[PDB]
Amino acid sequence: VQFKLVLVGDGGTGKTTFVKRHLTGEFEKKYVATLGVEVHPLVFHTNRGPIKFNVWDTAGQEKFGGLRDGYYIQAQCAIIMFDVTSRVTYKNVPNWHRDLVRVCENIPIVLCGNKVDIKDRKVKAKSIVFHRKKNLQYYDISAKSNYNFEKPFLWLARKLIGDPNLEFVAMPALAPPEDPALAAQYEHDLEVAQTTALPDEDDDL
Amino acid sequence: EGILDFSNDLDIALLDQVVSTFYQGSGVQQKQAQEILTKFQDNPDAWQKADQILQFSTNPQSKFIALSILDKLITRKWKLLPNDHRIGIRNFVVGMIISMCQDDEVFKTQKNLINKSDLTLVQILKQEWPQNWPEFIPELIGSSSSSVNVCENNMIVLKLLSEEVFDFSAEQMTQAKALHLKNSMSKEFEQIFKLCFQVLEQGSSSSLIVATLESLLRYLHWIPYRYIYETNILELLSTKFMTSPDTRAITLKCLTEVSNLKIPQDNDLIKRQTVLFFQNTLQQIATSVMPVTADLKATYANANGNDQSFLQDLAMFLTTYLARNRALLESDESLRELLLNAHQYLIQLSKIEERELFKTTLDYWHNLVADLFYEPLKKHIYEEICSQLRLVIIENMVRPTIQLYKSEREVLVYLTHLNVIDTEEIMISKLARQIDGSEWSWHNINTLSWAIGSISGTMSEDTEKRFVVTVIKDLLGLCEQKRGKDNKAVVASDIMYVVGQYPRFLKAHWNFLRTVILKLFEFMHETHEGVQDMACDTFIKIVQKCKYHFVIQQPRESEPFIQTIIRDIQKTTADLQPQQVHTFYKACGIIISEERSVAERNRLLSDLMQLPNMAWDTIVEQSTANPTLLLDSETVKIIANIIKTNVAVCTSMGADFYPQLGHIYYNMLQLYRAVSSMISAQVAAEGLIATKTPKVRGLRTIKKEILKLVETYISKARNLDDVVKVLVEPLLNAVLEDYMNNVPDARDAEVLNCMTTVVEKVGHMIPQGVILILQSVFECTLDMINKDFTEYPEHRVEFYKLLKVINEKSFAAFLELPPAAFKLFVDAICWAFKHNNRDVEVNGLQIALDLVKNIERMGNVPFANEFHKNYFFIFVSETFFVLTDSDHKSGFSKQALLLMKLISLVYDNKISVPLYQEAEVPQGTSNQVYLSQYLANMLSNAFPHLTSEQIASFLSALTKQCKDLVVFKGTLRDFLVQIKEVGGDPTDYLFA
Amino acid sequence: EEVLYKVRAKLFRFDADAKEWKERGTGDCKFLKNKKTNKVRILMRRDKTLKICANHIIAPEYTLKPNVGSDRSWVYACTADIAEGEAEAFTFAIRFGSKENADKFKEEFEKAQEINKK
Amino acid sequence: NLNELALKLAGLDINK
Ligand SMILES: Nc1nc2c(ncn2[C@@H]2O[C@H](COP(=O)(O)OP(=O)(O)NP(=O)(O)O)[C@@H](O)[C@H]2O)c(=O)[nH]1
Ligand SMILES: [Mg+2]
Secondary structure, eight states: OEEEEEEEEOTTSSHHHHHHHHHHSOOOOSOOOOOSEEEEEEEEEEBTEEEEEEEEEEOOSGGGOTTGGGGGTTOOEEEEEEETTOHHHHHTHHHHHHHHHHHOSSOOEEEEEEOTTSSSOOSOGGGOOHHHHHTOEEEEOOTTTOTTTTHHHHHHHHHHHTOTTOOBOOOOOOOOOOOGGGHHHHHHHHHHHHTSOOSOTTSOO | OOTTOOSSOOOHHHHHHHHHHHHTOOHHHHHHHHHHHHHHHHOTTGGGGHHHHHHHOOOHHHHHHHHHHHHHHHHHTGGGSOHHHHHHHHHHHHHHHHHHHHOHHHHHHOHHHHHHHHHHHHHHHHHHTTTTOTTHHHHHHHHHTTOHHHHHHHHHHHHHHHIIIIISOTTTSOHHHHHHHHHHHHHTHHHHHHHHHHHHHHOOOHHHHHHHHHHHHHHTTTSOTHHHHSSSHHHIIIIIHHHSHHHHHHHHHHHHHHTTSOOOSSOHHHHHHHHHHHHHHHHHHHHHTOOTTSOHHHHHHHTOTTHHHHHHHHHHHHHHHHHHHHHHHHSOGGGHHHHHHHHHHHHHHTTSSOHHHHHHHHHHHHHHHHHHHHSTTOTTTTHHHHHHHHHHHHHTOOOOOHHHHHHHHHHHHHHHHHOHHHHHHHHHHHHHHHHSSTTOOHHHHHHHHHHHHHTTTSSOHHHHHHHHHHHHHHHHHHHHHOOSHHHHHHHHHHHHHHHHTOHHHHHHOHHHHHHHHHHHHHHTTOOSTTHHHHHHHHHHHHHHHHTHHHHSOOTTOSSOHHHHHHHTHHHHTTTSOHHHHHHHHHHHHHHHTTOOOHHHHHHHHHHHTHHHHHHHHHHHHHHHSOTTGGGSHHHHHHHHHHHHHHHHHHHHHGGGGHHHHHHHHHHHHHHHHHHHHHHHHHHHHHOGGGGGSHHHHHHHHHHHHHHHHHHHHHHHOSOHHHIIIIIIHHHHHHHHHHHHTSOGGGOOHHHHHHHHHHHHHHGGGOHHHHHHHHHHHHHHHHHHHSSOSSSOHHHHHHHHHHHHHHHHHOTHHHHTSOHHHHHHHHHHHHHHHTOOSHHHHHHHHHHHHHHHHHHHHTOSSHHHHHHHHHHHHHHHHHHHHHHHSSSOGGGHHHHHHHHHHHHHHHTTTOOOSOSSOTTTSOTTOOHHHHHHHHHHHHHHHHOTTSOHHHHHHHHHHHHHTTTOHHHHHHHHHHHHHHTTSSSOOGGGGGOO | OEEEEEEEEEEEEEETTTTEEEEEEEEEEEEEEOTTTOOEEEEEEOTTTOOEEEEEEOOTTOOOBOOTTOSSEEEEEEEEEOTTSSOEEEEEEEEOSSHHHHHHHHHHHHHHHHHTTO | OOHHHHHHHHHOOTTO
16 A cells, blocks of 8 residues: 655755655755655555555756656656745746646645745745645645644545545554663763754754 | 667667666665666767657656657757758657557557657647648648547647647747747637537547547637637536536636636627526536535535535636626626525535635635625625625634634624624624533634634624623633633633723723733733733733723822832732743833833833842842852843843833833943853853853853844934944944954854844944944954855844945945955855845845945946946856856846846946956947957857857847846846757847 | 653754764653553654654663753663664654753653662 | 623632
């Protein structure tokens, strides 16, 4: 039970950071552009069993486009990303959408406005209407603050499974288990860790 | 990696497997095949092998990739090819598509490949049609009568062609090329429409019908209305194709676009047709889909088949048509049932649980009720619609997204004006159903309270009084009857929310208002989560609107209530968190600023600030002897909280805060110096890591809050002379040298922000102060931010805000820079051009434009002459570089404006000196002639694939258009298209 | 299992080969005492997705060390965490909403260490 | 005036 998800949108909109947050829980502060595509498996636990997303995280910079719409073949669902602090990334949403549905003519698609955590929002909520006539689901999201970060996959899972009451559920937690030749090794990396300041100390958590 | 070798022949069987490993594989093997295929696709000679793949391969994905490689070729190098390659590709693509439509196995099971081939054909039509292919449309229509698979596929080709020409051309082709293609499609559409209309009338293949309707959706974006209204096609769309669910979805989208056609607003026959297709559509929906009484909320939630998309498209159709044409249905009595059924479907659609769909219907309801509020003799038609709408909106009231809340409030306010009595009854009924428990819920009582609060100010004062009193009584009764702290806290919060929303009611009943406030004070001691925050938020909310009733002495009282608030302030706030105390003090500051007797206002300010001032004097005393106390975190937190309290009060009092600022100002700046020393000493003792410690972060908070306080007052001051004479001088002495002489990691970017405010408000009065600000922060901050675009992001943004305001208000400061430093200034501006960061890039472009204007205003003086000699072409060429490098597209408009200003300077002879060296060009050569030669050489080296004719034609148009920004920008956009390909037509630049 | 302690927290893991802290999850950190073995473990799930980011026993050998940049965080090396499959070794940092909760956590973390020695 | 209404509000106690 796995589904192919293509993730498209302008470079810098946060497609890769969004996926990494779902893969490991980290927030990557650096912008390292994707070259072509990076495929990652992504599993969610639902009351209808596990659902597996094969995320085709494509490249937004044109010079790194790779196979471009070649990545969209046999996609079963998609996420279009843009940056609410960059109006040009929303202006290009119809371009990403046109290329996408020319290959995948009837797949569920989520339009995501990323980076809503930033105060100086440039693409106002009143201006985001492209999803209406194209029947896309829309969400404000922030990969940094995790605002609505689970909504795109929850909505897609419901569409793909055909169950509108599908919900994420807690994965079962098996019991955890319980030498001196590594005491000096772990103590070395602990000391380095204590001297490296935790990031985002002004945050509430 | 064998296929990447073009020395040997391409192994088609190996390609089909590399392609399979990529699409169906996983792991490292898929990742390796990925990098291989990208390299194979990027080889500039791979297009030559594309005919092998399309002919020999058995893998449809390989043929897709081959068509992509072709697409790159057709898009960027088609004109550089020998003329016979162009004929072979065109013949091959045309032949391959003909063959695929004949094999029903291929035509049925390879839609992706046929669509990709149809798009590739369209790319060829954009290059070749119709000038080198004048019989395409006639031969397309002829071959459509042969096969049904060809007729259907030709509708796909025509759909894509319409999209590339009319929907997606503006960015991707030049203005001349786009117009050429639009004119070509327009001249031959009559034949296209008849073929399209014949298929729609003659049936019968549903896939052929759907592909024909999908192409009709695209045509409606641009075709003249006569094709729709002077044929029978509206009847077909609104009746035949609405019954079958295969064609229903696309037909509905077509009718939505038909409702958007440009159409003569005076012909009565057309008005009849516009009414008629709406009546047919609503009839087919009632009989073939669902009756107007159906529960669309449940249907949508069930999410069967395509129901959600259909209900979305129905909402779009109804709202689009009714916003434009509902007046057609409002006068005729035979159309009244059709008008109200349509709105009843919208009522049902508005109950769907779907945020984005609700905003779409809500926007229409806003359009309607605003019209019933203003247009004569209309509201009577819709009263039963409006009565239902009141309940729909009250029951979906959201927490005050605030954007959705403001839209909901606006509609509900209109609806309250339209019928106050009906609005009261619904709200009291809803409250009654909260009290009897049938609809009791934390979410439900909260939602109702928001709705009740939203309509404040729309009823008459006396009607509002009885409404409010009824609601408060019922809400108090609801609290009494509930059990548990959880339930009782919810009702009490809603009680406070409602009263906070009705200031006109509070202002007329002082005894009740005082009871409210004293109750909020009671709640500031309530440990229950959220109550204290609610008490503080309600307190300041009421104060903002009713402040005047706290400053004057109320009848039956011995003192203004503000005196009572200040007297008990320690007891009132004793259990609040620091940020809640600051809100409280901020609220008192609002009240005090209502007192305009200066002596009484300052006394209130002194009394309010008594506790922070007493805690301040102690710390100034005991932390000056001796400065060990600042190591104690507890002392640092007390200092930060004292200053934050001062910020809170200064925020609301602004100019009136000056007496309190003077009470602490000199000791505050001394404390700023002492805190700066300890940060510096701590970085010396422990290294740069010290800046990450709680101790240093607490110390830097003191400095940051001190700057924010000074910044807050100065931005709001009215006596600018005191700012200049009393505040500016000690401030610069306290912050400038400390900033300059700290290591980069210890410099507070808030210093730059504070200096920006100072220059913004009194910059025109302190020219020597501005110079000292530049000397202390310019070169050392620039060195922090000019090695990459990443490090020190805050300093980066504040730096250019500071330079921007200095350039606006005290340009003379830049005139006194040494030539080496003024050169770093120019570098810094251009450096800002290159940022992707929007804050930096916009300011950098604005500074450049203001700087050129600053230089123009100087006239024919040696500094202006030397500026143009040293930096004119630097600015011209640095601007061109960001214009053309495809990585700064967000700044196009302002790049275009700066460039137009630079070019127009030369073609208006506003540069006196020659811009060239007297040897490199004959004497007496105009700057215009030299400018065109410089630009031609620059673009020839930067874009070597352009012909000299292209560059000359582009520059000729560009310079001739430097007084017409809209045209100038169109020419830049044409240039940006032509540099992405080879062989661009130089005559394109004659478009305007 | 029985819930001995529950606190909101943000869990980090140290990437030694990058000299960097990486977030692992945010959500409720719980001290769970098994009732048929009396062993106490750390179970922590991410908000919304409810995926496990911490799953290890509060070993009596573990020691909470403060981080240089925080008065509301503890750092400790973990030898067997099974949040993502096989028992891996991690250097964990866990941060809380206030110094109060971080101090309360250390108290509860040490009480649980006594329970797991019996 | 609303003296009775103010008396009810003053009485309000979410802990009873
Ligand atoms: N403030 C904020 N920044 C974010 C957010 N999401 C991503 N970013 C930042 O935006 C930058 C872009 O990161 P990235 O995920 O690689 O974007 P991308 O769309 O994958 N780039 P490309 O298409 O070229 O591969 C990163 O620096 C990241 O920290 C967010 O939600 N909020
Ligand atoms: Mg990426």
